[PDB]
Design a protein around this ligand. Structure first.
Ligand SMILES: Cc1cc2nc3c(=O)[nH]c(=O)nc-3n(C[C@H](O)[C@H](O)[C@H](O)CO)c2cc1C
Ligand SMILES: Cc1cc2nc3c(=O)[nH]c(=O)nc-3n(C[C@H](O)[C@H](O)[C@H](O)CO)c2cc1C
Lengths: 115, 115
């Protein structure tokens, strides 16, 4: 049986597991894959920083890293790239998800291109 | 936000996390707590072997351990005990749950007293 992770949420959605090394994605929606130009096999198990590219702001990247450590709700606009190298401004919304014990379980991310 | 783990299942249900040390319970249903006589704080974070007691069969315990390592569906009758020390035969049904990647994510257990 496969865990229905979407039962924890028409949008680009990602779930990551901070208990695993490098905080890898464990679920991505089809909308995410279509927008970024990747297949499921290319994404699952990797950190979502593969969306970052040559002109991505390094301070924006560090802001996200600290926001994760803070375990709080945050949103940020960051330059991301598709597999074909085309760039888009990504409005990234991230929030922590806890287990009934109160321990950090997943991060949930909802993305959408800013236009 | 707390993950709705029950959205991955009137019965005694338990979820454990084999990625954490000692494969601790991360969710238990109210029915489980009522039958065993424990509070939520006494259970979450512990391995479910606290239900085992003086006359529990050690081969049955080892059978469960191997069944977990096998990552397959199994059922077994094992003598368990409530907090007050009263004993009951527990029909334990266990199955593995995987993430979209195919990695083992949780174990799910459904219990009921045999009578
Ligand atoms: C659930 C989740 C979704 C994320 N989505 C994105 C994203 O769409 N684009 C991006 O550049 N970084 C994203 N990141 C940030 C990235 O994985 C990494 O944490 C940062 O680069 C800081 O190291 C995400 C992080 C998490 C936890
Ligand atoms: C999801 C799950 C539920 C379990 N429930 C019980 C139980 O109700 N009674 C019991 O004696 N052992 C139970 N066990 C077995 C126990 O936690 C431990 O794995 C065994 O004692 C073998 O080490 C359970 C194990 C898992 C993974």
């Amino acid at each position: 049986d496969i865990a229905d992770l979407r039962a924890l949420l028409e949008m680009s959605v990602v779930f990551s597991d901070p208990s695993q090394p490098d905080n890898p994605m464990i679920y991505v929606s089809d909308a995410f894959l279509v927008q970024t130009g990747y297949t499921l096999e290319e994404v699952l198990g990797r950190n979502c920083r593969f969306l970052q590219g040559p002109d991505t702001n390094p301070h924006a990247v560090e802001a996200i890293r600290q926001g994760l450590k803070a375990e709080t709700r945050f949103t940020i606009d960051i330059l991301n790239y598709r597999k074909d190298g085309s760039a888009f401004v990504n409005r990234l919304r991230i929030r922590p998800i806890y287990d009934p014990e109160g321990n950090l379980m997943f991060f949930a991310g909802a993305q959408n291109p800013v236009l």
